[PDB]
Amino acid sequence: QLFADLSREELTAVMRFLTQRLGPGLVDAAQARPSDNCVFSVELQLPPKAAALAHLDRGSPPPAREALAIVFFGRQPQPNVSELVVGPLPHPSYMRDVTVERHGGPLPYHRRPVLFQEYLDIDQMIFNRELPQASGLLHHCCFYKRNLVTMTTAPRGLQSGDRATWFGLYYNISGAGFFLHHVGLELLVNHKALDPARWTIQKVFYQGRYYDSLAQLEAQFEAGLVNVVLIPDNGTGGSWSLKSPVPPGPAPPLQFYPQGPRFSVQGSRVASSLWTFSFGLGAFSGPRIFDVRFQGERLVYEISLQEALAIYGGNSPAAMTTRYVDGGFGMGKYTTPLTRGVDCPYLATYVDWHFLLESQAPKTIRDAFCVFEQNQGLPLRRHHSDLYSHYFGGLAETVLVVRSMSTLLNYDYVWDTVFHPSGAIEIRFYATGYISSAFLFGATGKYGNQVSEHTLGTVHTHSAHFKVDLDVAGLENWVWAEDMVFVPMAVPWSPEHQLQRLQVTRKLLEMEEQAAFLVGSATPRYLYLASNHSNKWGHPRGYRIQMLSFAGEPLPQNSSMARGFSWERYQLAVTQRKEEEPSSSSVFNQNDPWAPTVDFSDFINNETIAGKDLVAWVTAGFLHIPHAEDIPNTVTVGNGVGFFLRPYNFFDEDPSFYSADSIYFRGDQDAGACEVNPLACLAPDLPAFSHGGFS
């Protein structure tokens, strides 16, 4: 299993090694202060592609199996973040610092994600030292005494090098989302200092007005210059609960496998009579799929989530300057247990996921993946003939699915990899869970809708970026753009007459820039990566990229931070796959987008894409103005974005023709005979329910 994420054992063994090589003074990241040395991340380092294909397709031995550790080196004159590759696994022997090799220099220490212990320190400051200075105001507005909690925001500051975060204050609602109860107080905390003692509060926001400290605010209030409204800290309805007041009814439909599962899961490889592939989670990039072979032939080397991005508006400071680059938190790191029956079909197969993050010992997110077959209740294809000959032929589409979900504070991102029996691959991304809210005060008409009492549903956009490493019939691929045109010309057999003549238009895209399409501008209706090899009928074997996106307007290029997610400007882009261009974002962009650790636009640089090993990059998104129907959560309906990889002259005929599940009968046959029709042929056992728990 070349692409399997690191096991608990491998994780442990690399942490063992790291502790030896870094002579103590090394602290457990779970309790580390800024000036300490700690291990932040330890996870699988993906192998180089050539070495891997060598192994998979030519017997050649397995590329060394290595880990990548992210270390916070704060205990030194010039602190920094280092990426260290760790030696041959199962039993590590070397350690290699690749930081400069990759970035050209050190990683500025301020790009390091805010540690859990850091958030904790920030809270101690706010709750123990800063808030009690306004115990007057906070008593008359927010039942102060703790009853409140904080939620961090986007990039932290305004220039490269800043580490100042706007926090909102929310009623600490129990058993339900606190995100819907902003109490109207927002704090700009400056925690750039290595000594948490020197941490200050640069700004304060309350009801439309800014102050320089809480004392200054508490002042204006004791001076009777601030009007306070007692925000209720309790209620009933969707705003306050997630539990339905309605008794359970008869159960929803259930799918089972009459003659047992028709696929198997072995570690991280999945196999069905049609598909074999590997799956996993990057701690920061999230879901990924490797070595996808349809009936033994490889279509894609890699499909992987690169980044998720949320961009906000609002009439409060926190909201209006919020741009989450979710990889900076980690789609994998924040993956949550799948609730059997709700998040996946009850009889799905559920797999665990192991990680060493902000810790010194491995941990496991139980039931992190689900794999299952799903009857779509829909024909993959069908024809019914009443004309000339009486026959029916069709096939009910069943689909193979791998899924994980990431809960980043509020939102719960659902990541779907769907394998169709037609030879097609579908990548879906559903955004559910809670919205972010602001306190409703002022002229909120331009920044969202009132979505509850005191609650503003702030306008925003969601986008995600995907890496699509297709290797259509080998590595050397070309990209084609086919479309249509009408050409007015005389009717051959009656030349006085005209006719708008429909024509196909093909165009080879030979330079990276030609296959870079921007959000906003139109893209060709047919776009695919081809080999020079042809199918039986002499057409380039190709796989077509079809996008499902309602992408909202991307953050303006003029923004000094826009280059921390330059991929958001592109619908689709295609480039030469390079070992040095592994991902299009980085865990280090979130905290310093002004000095991006990777800038996707760098990948598009006047190179040829004619006959190379290419890699496609797809962006999918939508705009979101919140409405009442988002209370409790936002629903998945309509907000599914992503793309299809559809075969296009790749095969000689539709592979599903050879399906073991296809149905066919003529008029002169007994369609109710089981030897004519398998449908005419012929008490699920259900495991005890169990939940992954919490942390």
Ligand X SMILES: *[C@@H]1O[C@H](CO)[C@@H](O)[C@H](O)[C@H]1NC(C)=O
Ligand Y SMILES: *[C@@H]1O[C@H](CO)[C@@H](O[C@@H]2O[C@H](CO)[C@@H](O)[C@H](O)[C@H]2NC(C)=O)[C@H](O)[C@H]1NC(C)=O
Contact partner, 203, from a copy of itself, ligand Y, ligand X, none, Cβ < 5-8 Å per class: a copy of itself
Which range binds a copy of itself by CB under 8 A, 57-65, 376-384, 580-588, 595-603? 376-384
For residues 71 and 347, which CB has a smaller minimum distance to ligand Y in the complex? 71
Strand partners, 614: 576
Identify which of 401, 413, 282 has the alpha carbon closest to the alpha carbon of residue 336: 413
- Ligand-binding annotation for 137, yes or no, is no
Is 624 part of any known ligand binding site? yes
CA distance 223 to 245: 45
Return the residues of window 12-31 that contact ligand Y according to CB under 6 A. 22
State the catalytic residue, choosing from 121, 291, 326, 343.
Answer: 326
Ligand-binding annotation for 607, yes or no, is yes
User: Binding residue for ligand Y (CB under 6 A) from 40, 72, 73, 588?
Assistant: 73
> Using H for helix, E for strand and C for coil, what is the string for 107-149?
ECHHHCCCCHHHHHHHHHHHHHHHHHHHCCHHHHHHCCCCCEE
Q: Which of residues 641-660 bind a copy of itself (CB under 8 A)?
A: 644, 646-660
Instruction: Rule CB under 6 A: choose which of 533, 578, 666, 691 binds ligand X.
Output: 533
Tokens of residue 503, six digits: 């024509």
Site for a copy of itself in 235-294 (CB under 8 A): 237-239, 241-260, 262, 273
Separation of alpha carbons 165 and 152, rounded Å: 7
The DSSP result for 568-622, as a single string, is GGEEEEEEE--TT---SS-TTTTT-TTS-S--GGGG-SS-B-SSEEEEEEEEEEE
Interface of this chain with ligand X, residues 201 to 220, rule: CB under 6 A: none
Question: Judged by CB under 8 A, does residue 368 bind a copy of itself?
Answer: no
- Regarding 606 and contact with ligand X (CB under 6 A), the answer is yes
Is 460 one of the annotated binding-site residues? yes
Interface of this chain with Cu ion, residues 599 to 628, rule: CB under 5 A: 624
Phi, psi of 124 (to 5 degrees): -50, -40
Indicate whether 646 belongs to the interface with Cu ion (CB under 5 A). no
533 binding partner (options Cu ion, Ca ion, ligand X, none; Cβ < 5 to 8 Å by kind) = ligand X
Q: Please, what is the Cα angle at 233 between 230 and 236, to 5 degrees?
A: 120
Distance CA 535, CA 421 (A): 19
Q: Is 124 in the site for a copy of itself (CB under 8 A)?
A: no
Give residue numbers after which the chain breaks (C–N above 2.5 Å).
Answer: 145, 682
97 is in an annotated binding site: no
Q: Which stretch binds ligand Y (CB under 6 A): 322-330, 384-392, 413-421, 541-549?
A: 384-392
Q: Which is nearer to Ca ion, 477 or 619 (CB)?
A: 477
Rounded Cα gap, residues 426 and 545, in angstroms = 10
**Residue 436: DSSP 8-state:** P
Cα separation, 617 vs 21, in Å, equals: 38
Q: What is the contact mask toward Ca ion in residues 420 to 459, using x (rule: CB under 5 A)?
A: ----------------------------------------
Residue 332 carries which side chain, given as an amino acid letter?
G
Binding positions for ligand X, 473-492, rule CB under 6 A: 476
Tell me the two tokens of residue 383: 């024809």
Quote the CA–CA distance of 131 and 181 in Å, as a whole number. Answer: 18
Does the annotation count 94 as an active-site position? no
Given candidates 605, 608, 636, 690, which one binds Ca ion under the rule CB under 5 A? 605
Residue 309 within binding range of a copy of itself, rule CB under 8 A: no
159 is a site residue for a copy of itself (CB under 8 A): yes
Cβ atoms of 201 and 178 closer than 8 Å: no
Task: Establish if 80 lies at the interface with ligand Y (CB under 6 A).
Answer: yes
Of the pair 74, 155, the CB lying nearest ligand Y is at 74
Q: Is 471 annotated as a binding residue?
A: yes
Give catalytic status of residue 195 as yes or no.
no
d(CA 131, CA 186): 11
512 marked among binding-site residues: yes
Minimum gap (Å) between residue 384 Cβ and a copy of itself: 4
Beta partners for residue 87, in sequence order: none
Binding to a copy of itself in span 590-649, by CB under 8 A: 622-623, 625, 627-638, 644, 646-649
User: What is the rounded CA–CA span in Å between residue 365 and residue 668?
Assistant: 57
Least Cβ distance, residue 622 to Cu ion (angstroms)? 8
How many Å apart are CA 297 and CA 378, to the nearest integer?
Answer: 27
606 interacts with, out of Cu ion, ligand X, ligand Y, none, CB within 5 to 8 A per kind:
ligand X
Options 211, 312, 411, 434, the catalytic residue: 411
Q: Which of residues 561-590 bind Ca ion (CB under 5 A)?
A: 575-576
Q: Which of 65, 82, 94, 91 is nearest to 5 (CA)?
A: 65
Closest CA to 203 of 217, 222, 192, 218: 217
Separation between Cα atoms, residue 488 and residue 465, nearest integer Å: 41
Please indicate if the annotation marks 581 as binding a ligand.
Answer: yes
Q: Which of 48, 611, 667, 684 binds ligand X (CB under 6 A)?
A: 611
Q: Which does 469 bind (CB under 5 to 8 A by kind): Ca ion, Cu ion, ligand Y, none?
A: Ca ion
> Does the protein bind Cu ion through residue 323 (CB under 5 A)?
no
- Closest alpha carbon to 646 in 424, 412, 473: 424
How many residues are present in the chain? Answer: 695
Q: Tell me the per-residue interface mask from 562 to 601 with ligand X, x by CB under 6 A, - otherwise.
A: ----------------------------------------
Binding flag, residue 532, ligand X (CB under 6 A)? yes
Taking CB under 6 A as the rule, does residue 146 contact ligand Y? Answer: yes
* Residue 613 in the binding site for Ca ion (CB under 5 A): yes
Angle among Cα 15, 25, 98 to the nearest 5 degrees reads 55
Q: How far apart are CA 202 and CA 218, in angstroms?
A: 16
Residues near ligand Y, by CB under 6 A: 22, 73, 76, 80, 82, 97, 100, 106, 146, 149, 172, 174, 388-390, 666-668
Which sequence positions are flagged as catalytic?
Answer: 326, 411
Binding-site residues for Ca(2+) sit at: 469-471, 512, 581, 603, 605, 607, 613-614
Binding-site residues for Cu(2+) sit at: 460, 462, 624
Residues near Cu ion, by CB under 5 A: 624
